[PDB]
Amino acid sequence: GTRQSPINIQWKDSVYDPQLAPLRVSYDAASCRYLWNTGYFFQVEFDDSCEDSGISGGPLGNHYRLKQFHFHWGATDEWGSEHAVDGHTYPAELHLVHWNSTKYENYKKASVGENGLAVIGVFLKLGAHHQALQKLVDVLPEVRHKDTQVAMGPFDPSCLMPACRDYWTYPGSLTTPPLAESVTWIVQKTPVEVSPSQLSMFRTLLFSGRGEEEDVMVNNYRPLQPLRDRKLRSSFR
Amino acid sequence: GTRQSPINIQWKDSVYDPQLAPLRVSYDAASCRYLWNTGYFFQVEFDDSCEDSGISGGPLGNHYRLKQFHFHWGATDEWGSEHAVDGHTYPAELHLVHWNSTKYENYKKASVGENGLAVIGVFLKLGAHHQALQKLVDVLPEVRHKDTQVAMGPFDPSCLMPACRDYWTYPGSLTTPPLAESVTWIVQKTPVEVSPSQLSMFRTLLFSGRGEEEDVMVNNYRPLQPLRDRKLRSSFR
Ligand SMILES: [Zn+2]
Ligand SMILES: [Zn+2]
Numbered sequence: 232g233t234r235q236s237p238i239n240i241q242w243k244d245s246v247y248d249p250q251l252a253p254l255r256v257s258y259d260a261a262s263c264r265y266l267w268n269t270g271y272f273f274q275v276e277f278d279d280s281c282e283d284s285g286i287s288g289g290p291l292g293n294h295y296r297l298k299q300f301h302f303h304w305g306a307t308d309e310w311g312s313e314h315a316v317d318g319h320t321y322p323a324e325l326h327l328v329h330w331n332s333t334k335y336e337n338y339k340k341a342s343v344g345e346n347g348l349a350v351i352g353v354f355l356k357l358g359a360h361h362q363a364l365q366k367l368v369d370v371l372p373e374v375r376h377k378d379t380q381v382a383m384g385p386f387d388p389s390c391l392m393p394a395c396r397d398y399w400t401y402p403g404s405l406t407t408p409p410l411a412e413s414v415t416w417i418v419q420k421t422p423v424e425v426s427p428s429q430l431s432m433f434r435t436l437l438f439s440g441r442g443e444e445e446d447v448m449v450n451n452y453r454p455l456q457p458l459r460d461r462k463l464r465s466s467f468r
Numbered sequence: 469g470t471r472q473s474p475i476n477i478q479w480k481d482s483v484y485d486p487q488l489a490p491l492r493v494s495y496d497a498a499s500c501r502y503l504w505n506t507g508y509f510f511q512v513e514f515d516d517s518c519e520d521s522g523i524s525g526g527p528l529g530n531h532y533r534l535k536q537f538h539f540h541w542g543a544t545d546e547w548g549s550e551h552a553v554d555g556h557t558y559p560a561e562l563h564l565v566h567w568n569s570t571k572y573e574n575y576k577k578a579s580v581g582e583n584g585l586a587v588i589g590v591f592l593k594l595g596a597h598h599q600a601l602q603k604l605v606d607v608l609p610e611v612r613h614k615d616t617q618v619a620m621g622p623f624d625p626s627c628l629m630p631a632c633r634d635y636w637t638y639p640g641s642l643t644t645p646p647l648a649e650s651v652t653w654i655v656q657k658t659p660v661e662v663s664p665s666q667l668s669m670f671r672t673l674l675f676s677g678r679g680e681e682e683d684v685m686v687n688n689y690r691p692l693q694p695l696r697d698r699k700l701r702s703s704f705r
Contacts (some may be wrong), residue, residue: 306486320490449486450705454633 234412235456236314237402240463248464250390252288254396256351258297260387266370268420268436270377271407272451274301275367275386279330279338284309286349287328290400290415295329295349298338300388302326303343303406304354304433306449313406314353314418321422322430323355324452342405347413353392358424359394362404363390368429376441393421397467420467434464471649472693474550474589477700482636485644485701490619491633491654493588495534497624503607504617508644509688510608511538512620516575522673523586526703527637527652532566532586535575537625539592540564540643541670543686549591550643550689551655558591558659561689564625570625584650590629595661600627605669612687613678630658634704643690650692657704 241264262278277284279296279307287294304323305311329349335341341348366386397420404412436448499515504607513536514521522533542548549561566586567578578584603623610618634657641649673685 307489310490447486 232262232404232410232412233459234402235410236406236414236416237315237453237455238401238403238458238461238463239315239318240454241317243276244458245463245465248466250452251290251400251464252465253464254289254372254398255267255287256392256396257284257453258321258384258387258388262297263383263386265375265380267365267380268377268448269301270438270440272301272303272370272448273371273374273436275383276407280304280340281335282332285332286327289417290464292346293331293333296332297336297388298328298330300325300391301328302433303452304380304430305448305452306434307356307432308357308427309402311450313450314352315455316354316420321354321356322407323425323433325353325355325391326457327351327353327391330386336443342413343409343411344413346415347411348405349415349417351392352396352416354422355425356422360426361424362424362431363387364386364425364429369412371432375435375437377438393419393423395421397421397465399463399465401458401461415438420465469641469647469649469693470696471639471641473653473694473699474552474690475638475640475698475700476552476555476692476697477636477655478554481695481700482702484705486705488527488637488701488703489525491635491703492518492524493626493629493633494522494669495625496521500593500620500671501518502619503604503611503615505611505614505685506538507614509538509665509673509685510611510670510673511536512604512623516553516567516569518549519569523588523658525633527701528586528607529583530537530568530570532696533575534625535565535567537574539627539670540689541667541686542689543662543696544654545594545667545669548687550687551589551591553657554693558640560592560662560670562590562592562660563626564588564590564629572601579650580646580648581650582603583652585642586652586654588629588635588653589653591656591659592660592662592667594664594667594703596659597663598625598628598666601666605666606667608673613674613676614654614674615677622670630656630660630681632658634658634702636699638698639694657702
C-alpha cells in the first residue's frame with residue numbers, strides 16, 4: 232500500500248500547479264434520498280442516475296457523479312478530522328464522494344478501480360451556527376442505531392462547502408475498507424464553521440444496532456498515513 | 469506494592485477510553501549522548517535539557533521529557549519481554565523513559581514520585597532486519613563489559629517505534645529497583661521486527677565488569693505481576 236489516505240497536508244510539500252482547470256460543482260438537490268447510520272458514520276445517499284448531478288474540472292479528466300456524503304469526527308472538539316494541515320486536526324470532516332461515470336459502469340466497481348472516485352474533503356471548525364447543516368442535524372434522532380434510515384427531501388451539498396474553493400489535491404485511497412486506492416482527493420483549504428451544538432448531536436449516534444449494548448459513535452477517523460512519494464498539488468499560489 | 473509491573477495484557481481487562489487525546493511524540497535526535505552497559509541491560513542516554521524532545525497526549529497531563537531507553541531480552545528467541553499480551557511473551561522489549569518536568573525539578577526525583585515517569589513499551593519480534601536498530605547493534609562490542617560506555621551520534625527513538633501507535637495504558641512501577649510506582653505505562657499494541665542477528669548481538673553483553681569471570685547478559689526481565697484492580701485502558705476499539 233503506497234497511496235493511502237489520509238495524510239498530513241504540509242505546505243512545505245505542496246506545489247502550485249497552474250495548469251489546473253477550474254473545478255465545476257453543480258449538484259441536483261432533488262436527487263437526495265435518505266440519511267442512514269452505517270455503523271461507522273452517517274451517510275446521505277443520492278440518486279446517481281441523474282448524470283447532471285456531480286463534479287468535473289480541477290484534476291479530473293471528465294465528470295464524476297455525486298453518490299453520497301458523510302462526516303468523520305472525534306470524542307471531543309480537539310480532534311476528529313482525518314486529514315491534518317501542518318499537523319493540525321479539526322473537530323470533523325465532510326467527504327463528498329463522486330464516481331467516474333465514463334471509466335466505470337457503476338459505483339461499486341468505480342470504488343475499487345483506478346481513478347474510480349473523486350472525493351472532496353471539507354474541514355469543519357467551530358464557529359457560527361450553520362443553517363443548511365441543521366437540516367441534517369434535525370433528523371439524527373431518528374438514525375441513532377446502526378443500519379437505520381430516514382427519508383430525506385431535496386438537499387444541495389454545495390451549501391456545505393466554503394465560498395473560497397481553493398484546494399490541494401493528491402492520489403489516495405478510501406479511509407474505510409477495503410481501503411482501495413481509487414480516489415482523487417480534493418481537499419478544500421478553507422473550513423466551514425458549525426456550532427458546537429450541531430457537532431454535539433453527531434456524537435449521539437451509535438455503532439450498535441438496537442438491542443445491543445450502547446456503543447457511542449466517536450473517533451471514526453483513520454490515522455495519518457505518510458505521503459511517501461506523492462505530488463501534493465495546490466490550486467492556489 | 470499494589471501497582472507493580474510488568475503485567476500480562478489481556479483483552480478481557482481492556483476498556484477503550486475514547487477520551488484519550490492523540491499521542492504526540494517528537495524527539496530531538498541530536499540530544500543523543502552515549503550508549504552504556506548498566507550491569508543489567510544496555511541504555512542509550514539523552515540530554516534532557518531540550519524542552520522539546522519528549523511526549524504529550526494520550527494519558528499524560530503534560531509533556532514528559534525523554535531521558536533514555538533500554539532493552540530487555542531472554543536467553544532464546546522464545547521469551548525476553550517483560551509484558552505479555554494474553555500470555556504471549558516476545559523475544560525482547562524496548563522501553564522509552566520520559567520524566568515529568570512539570571512536577572519534578574529533575575529525573576532522579578521524577579523517577580521515584582507521583583506521576584514522575586511515562587514509559588513506552590514496544591515489543592520486538594523476529595522478522596525483517598531493522599535499519600534503525602543496526603546503528604545500535606554496530607556499537608555493542610564496545611560495551612560488552614558492565615559500566616562501559618561509547619559516545620553516540622544523533623539518533624531518533626521513533627525509528628524504533630511501530631508505524632501504528634495504538635496502545636494500552638495503565639499505571640505501574642519501574643521494573644528494576646527501587647520498583648517505585650511512578651510510571652504511567654504506554655505499551656504499543658504493534659510489535660517492531662528485527663532479525664535474529666540483531667537480537668543475537670544483545671546476548672554478547674556481560675553482567676560482569678572487566679577482569680571478572682564472564683557472566684553473560686540474558687534474562688534481564690522481571691516476572692509478570694498481578695493487575696490487581698487497575699484500569700487497563702486501550703486507545704483503540
Ligand atoms: Zn470519509
Ligand atoms: Zn525497562
